[PDB]
Amino acid sequence: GELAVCDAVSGWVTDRRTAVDLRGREVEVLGEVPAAGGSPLRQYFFETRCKAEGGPGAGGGGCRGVDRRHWVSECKAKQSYVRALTADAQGRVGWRWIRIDTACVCTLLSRTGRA
Amino acid sequence: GELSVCDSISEWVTAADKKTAVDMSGGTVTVLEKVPVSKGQLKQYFYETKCNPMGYTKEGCRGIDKRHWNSQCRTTQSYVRALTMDSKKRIGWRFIRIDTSCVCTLTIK
């Protein structure tokens, strides 16, 4: 009988056309890896994101269970690096470490103990 | 920079330190040391993130409303593709599960 503080969604991502690398730059992500032999290997990932441009004023969407009286919170996605065949800004193709989303975590923005 | 409800640590794990792993279908596979690429070979490393055992959120996650809930920071897994070899010696790219986050979970009392 437990519950998530941030609602996440997990699945196959076949539409990731770009990603940020180890160095913080943006690289393009190829759809297929030329594997030695007959058919090319397909490049796709498995990622976890947040289930979270909304009416003005409104907002105030924090994490479930955080003391709204002490904290301003927000569910944000977390990254992990995976190796992927990609192309950089100048065209060089190659294997680089890229950030994909592997979780939806709660972030505390400001305040504390009834300040 | 950012402040999470749960403390976590991350590290580059070598294939040698993760020689066998469980794949999507629930099977055990052997993770290879090197992945062949045209022009050479790359070493297989994994980037894992788990709850920090030397941190401040062992008792409960930060900022939770103690008046209505209990909390717990737990390491969660996710699938990452790797060049593996199954029990029948077949070499192939499979999705194995590795530690990727440390998330909070609410519980009553």
What are the chain B neighbours of A14 within 8 Å (beta carbons)?
Answer: none
CB B52 within 8 A of CB B7: yes
**Cα–Cα distance measured from residue A41 to residue A94, given in angstroms and rounded to the nearest whole number:** 15
Q: What domains are defined for chain B?
A: 1-109 (2.10.90.10)
Whether residues B103 and A5 touch (CB distance < 8 A) is answered with: yes
CB A8 within 8 A of CB A52: no
Give the side-chain half-sphere CA count within 13 A for B36: 8
Give the side-chain half-sphere CA count within 13 A for A48: 21
Q: Is the dihedral angle over the CA atoms B49, B35, B96, A88 positive or is it negative?
A: positive
Pick from A3, A5, A1: which is nearest to A76 by CA?
A5
SS3 A29: strand
**What is the distance, to the nearest Å, from the Cα of residue A43 to the centroid of all Cα atoms in its chain?**
17
**Cα–Cα distance measured from residue A25 to residue B52, given in angstroms and rounded to the nearest whole number:** 28
Pick from A93, A103, A92: which is nearest to B104 by CA?
A103
Q: What domains are defined for chain A?
A: 1-115 (2.10.90.10)
Phi-psi region of A59 (alpha: psi -120 to 50; beta: other; left: phi over 0): left
**Cα–Cα distance measured from residue B19 to residue B7, given in angstroms and rounded to the nearest whole number:** 27
The contacts of residue A97 (CB under 8 Å, 6+ apart) are A21, A22, A81, A82, A83, B47
How many residue contacts between A and B have a Cβ separation below 8 Å? 112
Residue B9 has a CB neighbour count (10 Å cut-off) of 13
Whether residues B101 and A78 touch (CB distance < 8 A) is answered with: yes
Pick from B105, B71, B63: which is nearest to A110 by CA?
B63
Where is chain A broken, named by the residue before each break, C–N > 2.5 Å? 52
* Token pair belonging to B97: 């599960």
Whether residues B47 and A48 touch (CB distance < 8 A) is answered with: no
Deposited resolution, Å: 2.8
State the nearest Cα–Cα gap between B77 and chain A, in angstroms: 9
Q: Where are the alpha helices (DSSP H) in B50-108?
A: none
Q: Which experimental method was this entry solved with? A: X-ray
What are the chain A neighbours of B103 within 8 Å (beta carbons)?
Answer: 4-6, 103-105
DSSP structure class, residue B90: -
What are the chain A neighbours of B15 within 8 Å (beta carbons)?
Answer: none
- Largest distance between two CA atoms of chain A: 65
